[PDB]
Amino acid sequence: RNLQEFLGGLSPGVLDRLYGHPATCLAVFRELPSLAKNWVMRMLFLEQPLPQAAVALWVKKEFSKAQEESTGLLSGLRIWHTQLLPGGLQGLILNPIFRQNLRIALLGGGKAWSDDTSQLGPDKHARDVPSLDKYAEERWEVVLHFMVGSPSAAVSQDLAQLLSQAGLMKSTEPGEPPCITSAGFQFLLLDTPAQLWYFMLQYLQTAQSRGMDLVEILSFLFQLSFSTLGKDYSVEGMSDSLLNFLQHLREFGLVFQRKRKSRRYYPTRLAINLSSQPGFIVVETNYRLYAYTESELQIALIALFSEMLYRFPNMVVAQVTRESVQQAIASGITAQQIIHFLRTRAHPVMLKQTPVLPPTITDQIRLWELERDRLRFTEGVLYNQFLSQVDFELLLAHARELGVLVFENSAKRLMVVTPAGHSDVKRFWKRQKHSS
Amino acid sequence: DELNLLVIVVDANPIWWGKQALKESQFTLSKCIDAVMVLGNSHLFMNRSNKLAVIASHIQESRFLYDGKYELLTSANEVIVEEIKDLMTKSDIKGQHTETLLAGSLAKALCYIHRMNKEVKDNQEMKSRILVIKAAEDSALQYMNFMNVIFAAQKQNILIDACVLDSDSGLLQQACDITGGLYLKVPQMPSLLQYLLWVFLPDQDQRSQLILPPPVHVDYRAACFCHRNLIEIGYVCSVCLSIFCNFSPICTTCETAF
Numbered sequence A: 001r002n003l004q005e006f007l008g009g010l011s012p013g014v015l016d017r018l019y020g021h022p023a024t025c026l027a028v029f030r031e032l033p034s035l036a037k038n039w040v041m042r043m044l045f046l047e048q049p050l051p052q053a054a055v056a057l058w059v060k061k062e063f064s065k066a067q068e069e070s071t072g073l074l075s076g077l078r079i080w081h082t083q084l085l086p087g088g089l090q091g092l093i094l095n096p097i098f099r100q101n102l103r104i105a106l107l108g109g110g111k112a113w114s115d116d117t118s119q120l121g122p123d124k125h126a127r128d129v130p131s132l133d134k135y136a137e138e139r140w141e142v143v144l145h146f147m148v149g150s151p152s153a154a155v156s157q158d159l160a161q162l163l164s165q166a167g168l169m170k171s172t173e174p175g176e177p178p179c180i181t182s183a184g185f186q187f188l189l190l191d192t193p194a195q196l197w198y199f200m201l202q203y204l205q206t207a208q209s210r211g212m213d214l215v216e217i218l219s220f221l222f223q224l225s226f227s228t229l230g231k232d233y234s235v236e237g238m239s240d241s242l243l244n245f246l247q248h249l250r251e252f253g254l255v256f257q258r259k260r261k262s263r264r265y266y267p268t269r270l271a272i273n274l275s276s277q278p279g280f281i282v283v284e285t286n287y288r289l290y291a292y293t294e295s296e297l298q299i300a301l302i303a304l305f306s307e308m309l310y311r312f313p314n315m316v317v318a319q320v321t322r323e324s325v326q327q328a329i330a331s332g333i334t335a336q337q338i339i340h341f342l343r344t345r346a347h348p349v350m351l352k353q354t355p356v357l358p359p360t361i362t363d364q365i366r367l368w369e370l371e372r373d374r375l376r377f378t379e380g381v382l383y384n385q386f387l388s389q390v391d392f393e394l395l396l397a398h399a400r401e402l403g404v405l406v407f408e409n410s411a412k413r414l415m416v417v418t419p420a421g422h423s424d425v426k427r428f429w430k431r432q433k434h435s436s
Numbered sequence B: 001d002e003l004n005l006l007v008i009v010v011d012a013n014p015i016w017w018g019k020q021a022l023k024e025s026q027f028t029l030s031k032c033i034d035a036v037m038v039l040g041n042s043h044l045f046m047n048r049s050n051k052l053a054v055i056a057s058h059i060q061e062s063r064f065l066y067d068g069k070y071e072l073l074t075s076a077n078e079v080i081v082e083e084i085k086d087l088m089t090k091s092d093i094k095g096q097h098t099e100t101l102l103a104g105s106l107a108k109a110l111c112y113i114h115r116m117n118k119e120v121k122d123n124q125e126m127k128s129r130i131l132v133i134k135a136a137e138d139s140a141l142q143y144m145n146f147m148n149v150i151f152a153a154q155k156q157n158i159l160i161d162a163c164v165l166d167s168d169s170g171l172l173q174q175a176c177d178i179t180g181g182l183y184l185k186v187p188q189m190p191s192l193l194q195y196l197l198w199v200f201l202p203d204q205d206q207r208s209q210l211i212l213p214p215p216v217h218v219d220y221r222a223a224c225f226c227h228r229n230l231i232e233i234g235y236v237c238s239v240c241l242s243i244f245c246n247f248s249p250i251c252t253t254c255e256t257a258f
Ligand SMILES: [Zn+2]
Pocket: B224, B225, B226, B227, B243, B244, B245, B246
């Protein structure tokens, strides 16, 4: 799921409380479509509602579908609310709180998002941007290795429980380590910003168990999203629970902090990328992958759907075979996920070509994917004992009404239904003959 | 992957703004600078990948101008304010030159766009457009350079948009017509920013979706070689295509070439 889907199901009060922070409003505005942004900007400096027809006349008739979609999305997000214009007309005006916060974020005004940074002076143990990036990469690699099950990576108990609640890994028995499921493989194949966003969404969903304020967590996350890289921020000014949540972020690599009691925290590159690098995989027409990577995580991920051939100290040469792709699919990974992963990790050299990946390789992978699903199997019960067409039609209509029909053929008067509905169909058939 | 580059050329001619300030009108150069900064902030807020550039023209030369609000936007506004203050404070009238060096600013903008295009990754295309706001009167002495700039922009497919404040310029109309840009005259100066947020804010693809005012009557009067003034009917050479206001027994340009 995406941000818009998550925000659609929230109550109006929660949405209004979210708009109280300028950082949240900017993120919501950037998540809007291109057409919606122009409407928001035009209505930013308006103190009076506008007629619905006047707004509808801005976009041409041919692109009315995009206008309708944008209007529906804005109404669902409650960015604007319809106003009862005098004379029976309907006026459209943006939410005053959202508009005020957006103007504060853009034009200026009010207090800063962070309390202060120069009160405590320069950090005694400050790090650099490459160090923060290395720390974030190490944390993410440790998390993903713990997802795989490598003993070298050990995380906190609550983090492991969160993965179990997310369904990526299941713990069949207490004490024994959980096993990664197909959903875990799909999560691994996802892009890093997508993985971070999915993990944050799962955290937000499970936050209701801990009784934490969703609005505060969302506002803090959005503030971290726009935070400048390499600049510390004041820990003070936050509730006790949020700091605890921040500690979990410290385990996730999004936020770096020297000590729990330290008053300085440095947002990392991964935290910035959460709101939204060059790729290290070269794909050749002969079904060969050349990866410029050294960490065991990427090697394992590539070996999930490919056969390894050579491992030079700074290079990995692998071959994409039919058997490897079939094994990966049997593991639960679809071809679309593999193609997306290859495109995301594609080397910058391959970006020169008009297609990111050669069409032949993608077509071959997709065809290999369809090989497993070529045969369709449906367990059920077949009825072929119809003496008359009229009797067959009534039973077929009853089965369709029950919604247990699998296959119908009026030409030969043969039908196939689910075993669960077989008892109901038999009871219906007996009643028709007995009552006759 | 959609890269939009917006370059804003600001006519900062001291004479016109001084006359406007002496008129004690509701519009000043400070309001224009604030409107330009707000437009740039809106453009940057439209998409993360969007890039902004501001160039201010003057009699001397062209200057590259580039707490509750965005941190990067705050730094950009501070840099723009510092640059414009440095340009205005050090602006000393040394000479009889009064026409705005609009051609030089456009040339610098084109050079900056060309520089930024190479740094763009091959997987993405950097769509670039140039917005020009005109305050002082147009200069007819720079006709050839202006036409060369227009042709260079057309070659690289760079939109040129003109926002005339007081006096209409035929050169800007020709540039908008040739490059496909939008030419608009401001009826009320204090409302200028709203126009910038209603017409020039959307990109070229977005402009097709929306409805825009029809282009104004574009003129195509040429400039005489020996007068550098707008003319309607003149003598044109059949070899070098030079334009003369009066008949001559021998073409000066052809006489120059040996
Ligand atoms: Zn002449």
